[PDB]
Enzyme design. Structure first.
Site, mmCIF file in Angstrom:
data_model
loop_
_atom_site.group_PDB
_atom_site.id
_atom_site.type_symbol
_atom_site.label_atom_id
_atom_site.label_comp_id
_atom_site.label_asym_id
_atom_site.label_seq_id
_atom_site.Cartn_x
_atom_site.Cartn_y
_atom_site.Cartn_z
ATOM 1 N N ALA A 10 0.792 -1.216 0.000
ATOM 2 C CA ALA A 10 0.000 0.000 0.000
ATOM 3 C C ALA A 10 0.822 1.262 0.000
ATOM 4 C CB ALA A 10 -0.934 -0.001 1.195
ATOM 5 N N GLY A 11 2.134 1.135 -0.175
ATOM 6 C CA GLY A 11 2.985 2.310 -0.177
ATOM 7 C C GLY A 11 2.979 3.028 -1.515
ATOM 8 N N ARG A 15 8.832 7.635 -7.045
ATOM 9 C CA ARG A 15 10.088 7.758 -7.782
ATOM 10 C C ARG A 15 10.124 6.867 -9.023
ATOM 11 N NH1 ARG A 15 13.442 8.814 -2.680
ATOM 12 N NH2 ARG A 15 12.778 6.617 -2.453
ATOM 13 N N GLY A 137 16.345 0.194 9.805
ATOM 14 C CA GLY A 137 16.097 -0.008 11.219
ATOM 15 C C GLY A 137 17.296 -0.748 11.779
ATOM 16 N N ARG A 330 3.111 -17.359 -36.149
ATOM 17 C CA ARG A 330 2.093 -16.819 -35.272
ATOM 18 C C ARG A 330 1.250 -17.926 -34.653
ATOM 19 N NH1 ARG A 330 -0.857 -12.745 -38.874
ATOM 20 N NH2 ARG A 330 -1.946 -12.150 -36.949
ATOM 21 N N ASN A 383 -6.834 -15.699 -47.205
ATOM 22 C CA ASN A 383 -7.805 -16.217 -46.244
ATOM 23 C C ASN A 383 -8.862 -15.285 -45.649
ATOM 24 O OD1 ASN A 383 -5.310 -15.091 -45.290
ATOM 25 N ND2 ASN A 383 -6.030 -15.590 -43.206
ATOM 26 N N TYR A 384 -9.096 -14.118 -46.241
ATOM 27 C CA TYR A 384 -10.058 -13.190 -45.654
ATOM 28 C C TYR A 384 -10.739 -12.280 -46.668
ATOM 29 C CZ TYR A 384 -11.093 -8.951 -42.685
ATOM 30 O OH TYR A 384 -11.552 -7.854 -41.980
HETATM 31 C C1 LIG Z 1 -12.482 -10.798 -57.080
HETATM 32 C C2 LIG Z 1 -13.119 -11.446 -55.849
HETATM 33 C C3 LIG Z 1 -13.441 -10.380 -54.799
HETATM 34 C C4 LIG Z 1 -14.435 -12.121 -56.273
HETATM 35 O O1 LIG Z 1 -15.027 -12.918 -55.179
HETATM 36 P P1 LIG Z 1 -16.340 -13.853 -55.282
HETATM 37 O O2 LIG Z 1 -17.541 -12.944 -55.224
HETATM 38 O O3 LIG Z 1 -16.241 -14.914 -54.222
HETATM 39 O O4 LIG Z 1 -16.173 -14.502 -56.751
HETATM 40 P P2 LIG Z 1 -17.563 -14.809 -57.567
HETATM 41 O O5 LIG Z 1 -17.389 -16.165 -58.186
HETATM 42 O O6 LIG Z 1 -18.726 -14.588 -56.649
HETATM 43 O O7 LIG Z 1 -17.759 -13.778 -58.795
HETATM 44 C C5 LIG Z 1 -17.388 -12.412 -58.622
HETATM 45 C C6 LIG Z 1 -17.750 -11.554 -59.861
HETATM 46 O O8 LIG Z 1 -16.603 -11.206 -60.691
HETATM 47 C C7 LIG Z 1 -16.805 -11.618 -62.048
HETATM 48 N N1 LIG Z 1 -15.584 -12.340 -62.489
HETATM 49 C C8 LIG Z 1 -15.085 -13.528 -62.000
HETATM 50 N N2 LIG Z 1 -13.974 -13.929 -62.591
HETATM 51 C C9 LIG Z 1 -13.728 -12.930 -63.536
HETATM 52 C C10 LIG Z 1 -12.697 -12.720 -64.507
HETATM 53 N N3 LIG Z 1 -11.674 -13.556 -64.702
HETATM 54 N N4 LIG Z 1 -12.777 -11.588 -65.291
HETATM 55 C C11 LIG Z 1 -13.796 -10.716 -65.126
HETATM 56 N N5 LIG Z 1 -14.817 -10.813 -64.242
HETATM 57 C C12 LIG Z 1 -14.719 -11.938 -63.476
HETATM 58 C C13 LIG Z 1 -18.088 -12.497 -62.058
HETATM 59 O O9 LIG Z 1 -18.889 -12.251 -63.187
HETATM 60 C C14 LIG Z 1 -18.761 -12.276 -60.707
HETATM 61 O O10 LIG Z 1 -19.984 -11.560 -60.647
HETATM 62 P P3 LIG Z 1 -21.355 -11.815 -61.436
HETATM 63 O O11 LIG Z 1 -22.326 -12.183 -60.357
HETATM 64 O O12 LIG Z 1 -21.706 -10.507 -62.118
HETATM 65 O O13 LIG Z 1 -21.162 -12.953 -62.405
HETATM 66 C C15 LIG Z 1 -12.156 -12.500 -55.247
HETATM 67 O O14 LIG Z 1 -11.969 -13.581 -56.128
HETATM 68 C C16 LIG Z 1 -10.818 -12.036 -54.633
HETATM 69 O O15 LIG Z 1 -9.828 -11.864 -55.324
HETATM 70 N N6 LIG Z 1 -10.867 -11.839 -53.282
HETATM 71 C C17 LIG Z 1 -9.752 -11.389 -52.436
HETATM 72 C C18 LIG Z 1 -9.152 -12.518 -51.552
HETATM 73 C C19 LIG Z 1 -7.892 -12.104 -50.760
HETATM 74 O O16 LIG Z 1 -6.889 -11.693 -51.332
HETATM 75 N N7 LIG Z 1 -7.964 -12.206 -49.405
HETATM 76 C C20 LIG Z 1 -6.865 -11.850 -48.514
HETATM 77 C C21 LIG Z 1 -7.190 -12.138 -47.045
HETATM 78 S S1 LIG Z 1 -5.960 -11.472 -45.911
HETATM 79 C C1 LIG Z 2 8.988 1.080 10.847
HETATM 80 C C2 LIG Z 2 9.466 -0.004 9.964
HETATM 81 O O1 LIG Z 2 8.699 -0.894 9.619
HETATM 82 N N1 LIG Z 2 10.732 0.081 9.608
HETATM 83 C C3 LIG Z 2 11.338 -0.839 8.616
HETATM 84 C C4 LIG Z 2 10.974 -0.430 7.167
HETATM 85 O O2 LIG Z 2 11.404 0.914 6.949
HETATM 86 P P1 LIG Z 2 10.448 1.924 6.221
HETATM 87 O O3 LIG Z 2 9.244 2.179 7.036
HETATM 88 O O4 LIG Z 2 11.322 3.111 6.010
HETATM 89 O O5 LIG Z 2 10.068 1.303 4.857
HETATM 90 P P2 LIG Z 2 9.131 1.708 3.783
HETATM 91 O O6 LIG Z 2 8.528 3.072 3.984
HETATM 92 O O7 LIG Z 2 9.756 1.602 2.469
HETATM 93 O O8 LIG Z 2 7.964 0.689 3.860
HETATM 94 C C5 LIG Z 2 8.179 -0.736 3.866
HETATM 95 C C6 LIG Z 2 7.148 -1.537 3.016
HETATM 96 O O9 LIG Z 2 5.913 -1.345 3.672
HETATM 97 C C7 LIG Z 2 4.956 -0.754 2.824
HETATM 98 N N2 LIG Z 2 4.089 0.153 3.603
HETATM 99 C C8 LIG Z 2 4.689 1.269 4.405
HETATM 100 C C9 LIG Z 2 3.875 2.086 5.116
HETATM 101 C C10 LIG Z 2 2.418 1.836 5.069
HETATM 102 O O10 LIG Z 2 1.632 2.543 5.694
HETATM 103 N N3 LIG Z 2 1.965 0.815 4.324
HETATM 104 C C11 LIG Z 2 2.708 -0.033 3.594
HETATM 105 O O11 LIG Z 2 2.111 -0.907 2.980
HETATM 106 C C12 LIG Z 2 5.743 -0.114 1.667
HETATM 107 O O12 LIG Z 2 4.910 -0.072 0.493
HETATM 108 C C13 LIG Z 2 6.989 -1.023 1.569
HETATM 109 O O13 LIG Z 2 6.679 -2.134 0.736
HETATM 110 O O14 LIG Z 2 11.621 -1.280 6.205
HETATM 111 C C14 LIG Z 2 13.085 -1.290 6.305
HETATM 112 C C15 LIG Z 2 13.637 -2.197 5.217
HETATM 113 O O15 LIG Z 2 13.185 -1.681 3.960
HETATM 114 C C16 LIG Z 2 13.500 -1.776 7.744
HETATM 115 O O16 LIG Z 2 14.936 -1.750 7.859
HETATM 116 C C17 LIG Z 2 12.879 -0.818 8.755
HETATM 117 O O17 LIG Z 2 13.194 -1.204 10.106
#
Ligand SMILES: CC(C)(COP(=O)(O)OP(=O)(O)OC[C@H]1O[C@@H](n2cnc3c(N)ncnc32)[C@H](O)[C@@H]1OP(=O)(O)O)[C@@H](O)C(=O)NCCC(=O)NCCS
Ligand SMILES: CC(=O)N[C@H]1[C@@H](OP(=O)(O)OP(=O)(O)OC[C@H]2O[C@@H](n3ccc(=O)[nH]c3=O)[C@H](O)[C@@H]2O)O[C@H](CO)[C@@H](O)[C@@H]1O
Ligand SMILES: CC(C)(COP(=O)(O)OP(=O)(O)OC[C@H]1O[C@@H](n2cnc3c(N)ncnc32)[C@H](O)[C@@H]1OP(=O)(O)O)[C@@H](O)C(=O)NCCC(=O)NCCS
Ligand SMILES: CC(C)(COP(=O)(O)OP(=O)(O)OC[C@H]1O[C@@H](n2cnc3c(N)ncnc32)[C@H](O)[C@@H]1OP(=O)(O)O)[C@@H](O)C(=O)NCCC(=O)NCCS
Ligand SMILES: CC(=O)N[C@H]1[C@@H](OP(=O)(O)OP(=O)(O)OC[C@H]2O[C@@H](n3ccc(=O)[nH]c3=O)[C@H](O)[C@@H]2O)O[C@H](CO)[C@@H](O)[C@@H]1O
Ligand SMILES: CC(=O)N[C@H]1[C@@H](OP(=O)(O)OP(=O)(O)OC[C@H]2O[C@@H](n3ccc(=O)[nH]c3=O)[C@H](O)[C@@H]2O)O[C@H](CO)[C@@H](O)[C@@H]1O
Ligand SMILES: [Co+2]
Ligand SMILES: [Co+2]
Lengths: 449, 449, 449
Positions: A10-11, A15, A137, A330, A383-384
């Site tokens: 609780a101190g 610093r 102390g 990953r 993939n997305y």
């Molecule tokens: C282009 C893209 C968006 C199309 O996706 P899709 O909708 O699943 O593909 P679909 O089969 O549904 O067809 C898409 C459209 O494009 C057209 N198309 C498909 N192939 C084509 C080509 N070679 N040339 C021209 N038009 C084309 C189609 O006519 C279709 O639409 P329609 O309904 O008018 O016929 C997709 O293929 C793509 O490249 N996606 C990106 C993926 C990616 O890189 N992801 C990264 C993740 S990190």
């Molecule tokens: C009176 C006492 O106990 N003295 C001792 C304390 O000194 P001292 O009291 O000077 O030490 P600190 O003020 O640093 O406190 C010690 C520890 O207690 C905690 N704390 C302090 C006050 C409070 O109300 N609540 C709380 O939780 C601090 O967060 C820390 O973790 O520790 C020293 C070692 O470090 C010892 O040599 C001392 O003899």
């Protein structure tokens, strides 16, 4: 035995210059305070009482351990006062261990040592001798026995000479803690409630206080700013590295390695410079990891070779795979045995079968690729459609020509061959050659700008 | 007050094995001597007299500060002789501070200290005590007062025992300097003109010499070879890192960070391992920079996330952008709010609008891209006919299919959709689907080689 | 003179947790024991007797030096016993130097020193004084003369106080060695044959033993686990770096540099952070290598600029080339003068002529490209039909439009121009424009999912 832990968090951490609670700043991939909770649960704590002051919202958001009990300390009137708040939940029959949320490296072994030392009815206290004990102390003993702690503000020039200092960690019984805590007053230099006074109270009650020391200084170092956090991070990484080296893992440069999670491994694993391991990573036998790789939450089978500058996340590689350099896998990427992934290739939710290769400038997402398949350079699975993601399936023995786009969903049968530069929008039959090419033509005597 | 600086940079730097003047070899992205000039101007020097010997051409080419006065020292007969050349331009009423062009880390604070210490009519001298004072001019005092300097070659075995040594930096009045400089002779071990003799001349004139010391040894360390330059570079980087850490910037490994320019920043900025910052870089709040990034002369807004191994030059990123890993932004790249750039993507003189994404294997140059645009993988803007470069404009809500080339100049209207594998040579209408695809065909029972 | 070397490499390396012989684990790109053999041959050894125990198969596989004589030690009964096996091949008239296969850093200079010190008919012994001499054979002297060695197990508490320890390296005459070796018994703590006893035998024969010391401790440090190997690797790299710096090579961070082979270089070469050099690398004058580059077995001409994160293997770059960032050159890549290779570009068995540029997302394999050629972004040479690889030839002044695939084998004549998005299956004439494009069409009011 029974035992509960209390973590003071609780101190104020001003610093740090942050808008995030201090104990949430991470070290080795995890919140400072999570480190303390881990040790607490690893020690066997029954309950873990988190004493906090503010940012409670950000705290509950990040901390979700089961034995976690939240205790609010609206006002920071001292450590003794903070313990007073948690006191109500202490069990007369249980030991109470106190810890700091900003002292992340404390070890369980040292805490176990303190545990076994606590005298019956007494107190276990952790102390360290420091070169410059300023600010800490001070530990006063009589005839060699700990009789109390004198805070730096209150010590006399003479007591300020004592180098044995209180680290702040101590263990006692719930009932005892409760009687002492109730007798605290704030007549002192700081004008607050010192949890450190209980040492005196216990002594004049006839009880005894035992002081054990940590294995290393960093074990009890606290974090008050980002430079100190940085320092501890390196200490931690150096320890991790040593363990691995001694366990049979070869690190080309222990200073240029970072482990921010858990690493399981086989034998003869070799790791080059600047590699980062995050989350849970499992390495089979003889895995080689080149320089600059970042591996997170992945499984890597025997004999895999990861080339330089390769990033892997939530991937699974079977035995004998080779990937990189400059490859990016990953979540969901899976490579079956002997698969190969070259440079500038990205995979996401895609499985590459046995012996299949994706050599260059390729993106494979949401795909299932069979065995012995060859993905020409420049191939991309689209993939997305902008709303949904779709799957691409490529059967065994397929040969995909360079710069081919496979608009998902699409399936390519076994043995098919896809002409270079093909845009695949329809399924391809087994043993067929797919193509969508314009014959090449020429224009004589052409002059550019 | 008034003050001028003289920088000796006419010495030979043979142990560098270079064809470039020694003081031009860089440290932290800038010439050693530029570091000294910066401190000189930051100290308030009115004039800066650069004393050089050769490579004057390469020197003037690289050095272009306004208060710069070039003084040639055709022959290097000693430091005293070099000062004699600059003497003519000293102002009787101004202080003259002497510096070395190969001692880059000297700090302004220490120079300010020396400034205020100079006795009236006396001399301010900077000295350090060294473990091994071999090679350095030895400081002789009488009854605790500096009475001169004995060069190593001339000292006696006994004087060679003195560990307080002359660093070479001193300040005095123009007139004084001029009278002393005129009385220099070269009867000595080296057979040259020691600027160090003026200490004696001043003393027997009744004047007093005061010696102040630097804050750190590296402050007055000179560079004679590349190993020493290397050492100082790390010292400098370590200081930079510390400042940033203490200022609220989190560095995952202060030893693996390099700042070769100026960094402005907000709060909670986090920087991972092996990041390099060059030129002028501005970071907003909560910016995260992954491992291995190189950021040069760029602006990065709040909450941006730069992934590992990303190179950014002269770029501008609005808030909440995410780029990398393996992304390369070249001069002119601009990302509006929330824009995303994936792996193996390059941008040059191109703006990516709000929420627009360029996820993979893409090259965008000389382009203007609207908001909420999706650039499929493999997309390339062909901005150069071999003589001129042309612009590509993509309106809002456009969806560019994977592997599309946009032959500039071309404009795609809002809401358009470009089929995968399209070669765009003509403008596309708003809400239209552009395509240039060959229908996919199949050849049964095809056998490869 | 005459001299042979014996290398003990038959010990078990269990603390390595490996399935590979301990002396085969590499340091700086080469087997620990190869380092010792190199020093042996560099010292002039006539014969090199390798004494091994197991993994002899893996050993012969990796070690193929000519003067190598394999001696099996079926049972490891001690160092003296191991020498007994090699004894039969010693020449009465030759000196015999003994070395350890797990002490890689020993230097030739120190070995040469030991050589010249060996008394006539005596023994040359290498010793070091250690802070903690535990575990090491202790050196006993009488009136200042080495009279023997007491193994740690056998020394008395008093002898255990001796800090001068046996490093294990010694030289003597073949005949002498043979007479002493024959008189070894194993009555001792370990119950084995100590080669260390010969010191005593020689002394009571009237002979004299001379002890010389190494230049550095690491010189005689042995490797028993991977942490120790790691440590030595850094020592080695630090030495390498220093040499280069002092030789005129600028390293931006000597701690982040790795040399695992041989580097030849010109003047003013500059190397940034985290660069790795492997195999044989030659750098011309003024070569600049950016951060994170991995260069293996390549030749790089004057004034080349290698940008960050570039991987080069078995490449050859003429003068003034610029490659990277994120470029990958594979075996056979050749760049003539002034050639340029951008980001995310891969080359394999391909020559890029004078002034030619391959700027982005491109793969060039098995290609011959003329001068002043421009390879548009996304270009790929499809050099493999799935069975054979074929060559692509592009003449001078050719302009290849973005996203072009060249299906090998194909030849493009001088001055030709290839339209963006072209699939080239047939030769192109000189000055002709090749194209295979579908005219772009549009579909009004198209709506995506
Ligand atoms: C282009 C893209 C968006 C199309 O996706 P899709 O909708 O699943 O593909 P679909 O089969 O549904 O067809 C898409 C459209 O494009 C057209 N198309 C498909 N192939 C084509 C080509 N070679 N040339 C021209 N038009 C084309 C189609 O006519 C279709 O639409 P329609 O309904 O008018 O016929 C997709 O293929 C793509 O490249 N996606 C990106 C993926 C990616 O890189 N992801 C990264 C993740 S990190
Ligand atoms: C009176 C006492 O106990 N003295 C001792 C304390 O000194 P001292 O009291 O000077 O030490 P600190 O003020 O640093 O406190 C010690 C520890 O207690 C905690 N704390 C302090 C006050 C409070 O109300 N609540 C709380 O939780 C601090 O967060 C820390 O973790 O520790 C020293 C070692 O470090 C010892 O040599 C001392 O003899
Ligand atoms: C092929 C290319 C060079 C033609 O450029 P252009 O001259 O501006 O296009 P034009 O409209 O002038 O017509 C070019 C010629 O090709 C012919 N042509 C156009 N489209 C054609 C098609 N689909 N099939 C066959 N011939 C076609 C035309 O007949 C015309 O000549 P003409 O005068 O005899 O009628 C160009 O479209 C291209 O691909 N440029 C490369 C861009 C690039 O990748 N830049 C990268 C920068 S880093
Ligand atoms: C499609 C491909 C496999 C054909 O190779 P090829 O056999 O050498 O070309 P061929 O001239 O022999 O003719 C192939 C067949 O396709 C047909 N064909 C050729 N061009 C065509 C076109 N534009 N549209 C439709 N069919 C076409 C022909 O009719 C021919 O067969 P046929 O005997 O029935 O007449 C090839 O051009 C290709 O793209 N290869 C991949 C190269 C590659 O990317 N390698 C990467 C290495 S890492
Ligand atoms: C006589 C003298 O001054 N001695 C001082 C000088 O030693 P010393 O004379 O040995 O120092 P150097 O030879 O390195 O020269 C000092 C600096 O002056 C420059 N230079 C030198 C000679 C010349 O004719 N022109 C010129 O411009 C060098 O380029 C260098 O930047 O520096 C030492 C610290 O480094 C001091 O401890 C010595 O007391
Ligand atoms: C008896 C003896 O020689 N003692 C020396 C030996 O100790 P010690 O005998 O303890 O050393 P080791 O057991 O490590 O063996 C030394 C070297 O000899 C090899 N080896 C060992 C036994 C064998 O039968 N075959 C074999 O080839 C090992 O692989 C290793 O390379 O080295 C120490 C330095 O490290 C010296 O200070 C000891 O005085
Ligand atoms: Co294409
Ligand atoms: Co493409």
């Amino acid at each position: 035995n029974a035992m509960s832990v209390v973590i003071l968090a609780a101190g104020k951490g001003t610093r740090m210059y942050s808008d995030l609670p201090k104990v949430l700043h991470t070290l080795a991939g995890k919140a400072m305070v999570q480190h303390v909770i881990d040790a607490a649960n690893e020690l066997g704590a029954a309950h873990v009482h988190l004493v906090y002051g503010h940012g409670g919202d950000l705290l509950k958001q990040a901390l979700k351990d089961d034995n976690l009990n939240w205790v609010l300390q609206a006002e920071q009137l001292g450590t003794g006062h903070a313990m007073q708040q948690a006191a109500p939940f202490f069990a007369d029959d249980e030991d109470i261990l106190m810890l700091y949320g900003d002292v992340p490296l404390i070890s369980v072994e040292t805490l176990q040592r303190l545990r076994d030392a606590k005298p019956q009815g007494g107190i276990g206290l952790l102390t360290v001798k420091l070169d410059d004990p300023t600010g800490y102390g001070r530990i006063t003993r009589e005839n060699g026995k700990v009789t109390g702690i004198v805070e730096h503000k209150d010590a006399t020039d003479e007591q300020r000479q004592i180098q044995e200092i209180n680290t702040g960690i101590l263990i006692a019984n719930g009932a005892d803690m409760k009687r002492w805590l109730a007798k605290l007053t704030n007549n002192n230099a700081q004008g607050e409630y010192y949890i450190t006074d209980i040492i005196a109270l216990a002594y004049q009650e006839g009880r005894e206080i035992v002081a054990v020391h940590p294995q290393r200084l960093s074990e009890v170092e606290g974090v008050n700013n980002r430079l100190q956090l940085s320092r501890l991070e390196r200490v931690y990484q150096s320890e991790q590295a040593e363990k691995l080296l001694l366990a049979g893992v070869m690190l080309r440069d222990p200073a240029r390695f970072d482990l921010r999670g858990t690493l399981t491994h086989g034998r003869d694993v070799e790791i080059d410079t600047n590699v980062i391991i995050e989350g849970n990573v499992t390495l089979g036998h003889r895995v080689k990891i080149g320089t600059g790789c970042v591996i997170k939450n992945s499984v890597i089978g025997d004999d895999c070779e990861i080339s330089p500058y390769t990033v892997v996340e939530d991937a699974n590689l079977a035995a004998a795979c080779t990937i990189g350099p400059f490859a990016r896998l990953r979540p969901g990427a899976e490579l079956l045995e002997g698969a190969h992934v070259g440079n500038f290739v990205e995979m996401k939710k895609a499985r590459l079968g046995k012996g299949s290769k994706a050599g260059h400038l390729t993106y494979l997402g949401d795909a299932e690729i069979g065995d012995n398949v060859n993905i020409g350079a420049g191939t991309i699975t689209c993939n997305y459609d902008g709303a949904n993601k779709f799957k691409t399936i490529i059967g065994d023995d397929v040969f995909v020509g360079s710069d081919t786009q496979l608009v998902a969903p699409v399936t390519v049968g076994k043995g098919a061959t896809i002409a270079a530069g093909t845009t695949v929008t329809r399924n391809v039959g087994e043993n067929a050659l797919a193509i969508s090419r314009v014959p090449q033509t020429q224009k004589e005597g052409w002059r550019r700008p």
